[PDB]
Amino acid sequence: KIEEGKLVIWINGDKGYNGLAEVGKKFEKDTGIKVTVEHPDKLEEKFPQVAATGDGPDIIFWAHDRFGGYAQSGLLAEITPAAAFQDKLYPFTWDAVRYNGKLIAYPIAVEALSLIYNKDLLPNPPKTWEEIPALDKELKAKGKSALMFNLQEPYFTWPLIAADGGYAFKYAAGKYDIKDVGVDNAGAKAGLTFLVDLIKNKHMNADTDYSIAEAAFNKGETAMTINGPWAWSNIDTSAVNYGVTVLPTFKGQPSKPFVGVLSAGINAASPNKELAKEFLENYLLTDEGLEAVNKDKPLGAVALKSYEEELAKDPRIAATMENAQKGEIMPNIPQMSAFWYAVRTAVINAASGRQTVDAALAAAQTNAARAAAEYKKILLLKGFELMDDYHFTSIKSLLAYDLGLTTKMQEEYNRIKITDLMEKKFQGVACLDKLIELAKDMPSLKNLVNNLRKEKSKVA
Ligand SMILES: OC[C@H]1O[C@H](O[C@H]2[C@H](O)[C@@H](O)[C@@H](O)O[C@@H]2CO)[C@H](O)[C@@H](O)[C@@H]1O
């Protein structure tokens, strides 16, 4: 249960959660309603799990691309801002938080990656990706390096993958086509090949994550990084005179970041929906409320018109918007999760040498476009729901290592949860092949396996 009479808020650890709590303490002062701001790890994954059982926070913050999956699962309340309030934010930020005709979150700020560069190490930052290897050789001779950014999250490597023509889902006739994915076309391959060549030539290292990259740039050890507005604050505290500018071009085309709109959603199980609306609309989405958060960690280009007029004067914000206008606003469709997981696997495997570029993106393509619900439906109705409780717990014990099933998970997870985890580890037809292989030599399920063999040909 969620505690009535107060507000719990989840926001990512890289945003200004202390400034957000200052706005919460003003809310407590004015109303008597305690606001608790928390930043748990993997919150975009933790929320769907806890919210699917009526738990979790009253308000969740994340970029808009996750919210369509949350809304489709019924985890959010439809927000209804009055006409007068909607006029206070830019029309396109409302578009980012609209799903199935319903507004499903409050838009807060627009984020786009930019190139951040140390002006003392590099007064003329490169215009092209192609010239960076030469810059790195010259900089390594001084004991520095040219560029370090997070290679563990595909968000940061996407601008280069999209540059020569890679894309997520085709936008066709007013809607996203979930079957037309562009992650293994010629442009996506060319971009990822360049990234792997940057690593193979020891200009970057496959192990670099967010913490390593940020520490490297803020200690003056690398000349450039790739990050968004939240990261400016820590560079201000460090002794690095930095600039924020346009991402380098690749093969003469601009880098195309996926643009995210930081948004706040209201848990459908929250008993404090009216309080949540009051806090977001009249304490956060004000010049005073946004200023408290922005001073902690820069939000980017805020959705609130009156306050963005002041922030648009900042050159770092003009750079953020210039990069954004070369990319696109992320889709919010529920398939975006499967897209991000698939691209993450491709970038990591290619960057490490596990798979060739062509192998990694081919797998990411088919995984992103796969008919996940179709196979889950077969796995559940024609597989798990046709075996008894004794055989179900036996199968879960066989799957323990593969699905990361603790002892408690093996006792409590039901067939729907196991079906979801299984198809995510064994994508598409492979999850039917894994159950057939697992239930092969169980004489009681010979009939079950018999149909799964036919229903996997029937679906094909
Ligand atoms: O890399 C996958 C990841 O990309 C985006 O996440 C961004 C987020 O929008 C930024 O605000 C910041 O926190 O960096 C994140 C990447 O680490 C998507 O929003 C997210 O759904 C996706 O998993």
Residue numbers in the entry: 1 to 460
From the paper:
MBP is one of the most commonly used protein expression tags due to its exceptional performance in enhancing the solubility of the target proteins. The death domain superfamily is a structural motif found in many proteins that are involved in physiological, as well as pathological processes. To explore broader crystallization space, we designed a series of protein expression vectors V28E1-V28E6 containing helical linkers of different lengths.
Indeed, both hNLRP12-PYD and hMNDA-PYD, two targets that failed to crystallize using fusion proteins expressed with the V28E vector, crystallized using fusion proteins expressed with these new vectors (V28E1-V28E6). Remarkably, we were able to crystallize and solve their structures using MBP-fusion proteins expressed with more than one vector. Similar to the hNLRP12-PYD, the human MNDA PYD domain was crystallized as MBP fusion proteins using three different protein expression vectors V28E3, V28E4, and V28E6. All of these fusion protein crystals diffract very well which led to their structure determination. Structural analysis shows that the designed “helical” linkers are slightly distorted probably attributed to crystal packing. Nonetheless, the target protein structures from all three different crystals are essentially identical with an rmsd of 0.30–0.40 Å, demonstrating again that the MBP fusion strategy enhances the crystallizability without alteration of the structural features of the target proteins. Structures of the hNLRP12-PYD and hMNDA-PYD determined with different linker sequences in different crystal lattices show no significant perturbation of the PYD structures.
